[PDB]
Design a protein around this nucleic acid. Structure first.
Ligand SMILES: [Mg+2]
Ligand SMILES: [Zn+2]
Length: 208
RNA sequence: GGAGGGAG
RNA sequence: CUCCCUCC
């Protein structure tokens, strides 16, 4: 009937903010979290340099906790004030019949089809782990200030020894670094959404 | 159950 | 840690 949790004022603000997108530009999307219970969400257009990055709190904290140690290293403490509903809102604003590019389209497909957008055409570059990540450290370097949200230490099976430490999976960096791979190098970036749209400024209060 | 991949 | 895909 309506769009949950967002008032009309900020919902129009959003819709205007997302008209800054070129419907026909190359458009990247990655997520952190399960498609059922996503936590981080990024969309990227290298052509303009503009991106949509925001956050959601997990409903399953158990599944979230494993995912953080072996994938994203996100501290649930840092999702503390995030716009409820934002995901459904942003997905709904995406242009009818859009073309998204991603890696491992199966997660992205599951999410969009759960938002009712079957109309969105998905292009999976279908790379390999070692190909796609080839621009990782440079992307993380030039672009570090854009995500401070992966605090955690992320690990991997060492063939000899069990845990080997790595660089975690940020929807945003992945978006950027996959483009770099598919375009053979690095492409200035601007957020489509205002900070107080993706995060509530929490105020001091008396507890009741 | 194995072989390989991919995702969080 | 957990999910997905392909193959026998
Ligand atoms: Mg992905
Ligand atoms: Zn991130």
């Amino acid at each position: 009937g309506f769009t949950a949790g967002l008032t009309y004022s900020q919902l129009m603000t959003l819709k205007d903010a997302m008209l800054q997108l070129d419907p026909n530009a190359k458009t990247w999307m990655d997520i952190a979290g399960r498609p059922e219970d996503p936590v981080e969400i990024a969309l990227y257009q290298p052509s303009s340099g503009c991106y949509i990055h925001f956050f959601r709190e997990p409903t399953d904290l158990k599944q979230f906790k494993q995912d953080a140690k072996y994938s994203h290293g996100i501290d649930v403490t840092d999702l503390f004030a995030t716009q409820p509903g934002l995901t459904s809102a942003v997905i709904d604003a995406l242009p009818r019949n859009m073309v998204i590019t991603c890696q491992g389209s199966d997660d992205i497909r599951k999410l969009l089809e759960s938002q009712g957008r079957k109309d969105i055409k998905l292009i999976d570059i279908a790379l390999s782990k070692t190909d796609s990540r080839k621009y990782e450290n440079a992307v993380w370097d030039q672009y570090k200030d854009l995500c401070h949200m992966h605090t955690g230490v992320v690990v991997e099976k060492k063939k000899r020894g069990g845990k080997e430490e790595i660089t975690p999976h940020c929807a945003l960096m992945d978006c950027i670094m996959f483009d770099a791979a598919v375009s053979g190098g690095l492409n200035v970036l601007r957020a489509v959404l205002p900070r107080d749209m993706v995060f509530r400024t929490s105020t001091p209060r008396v507890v009741l």
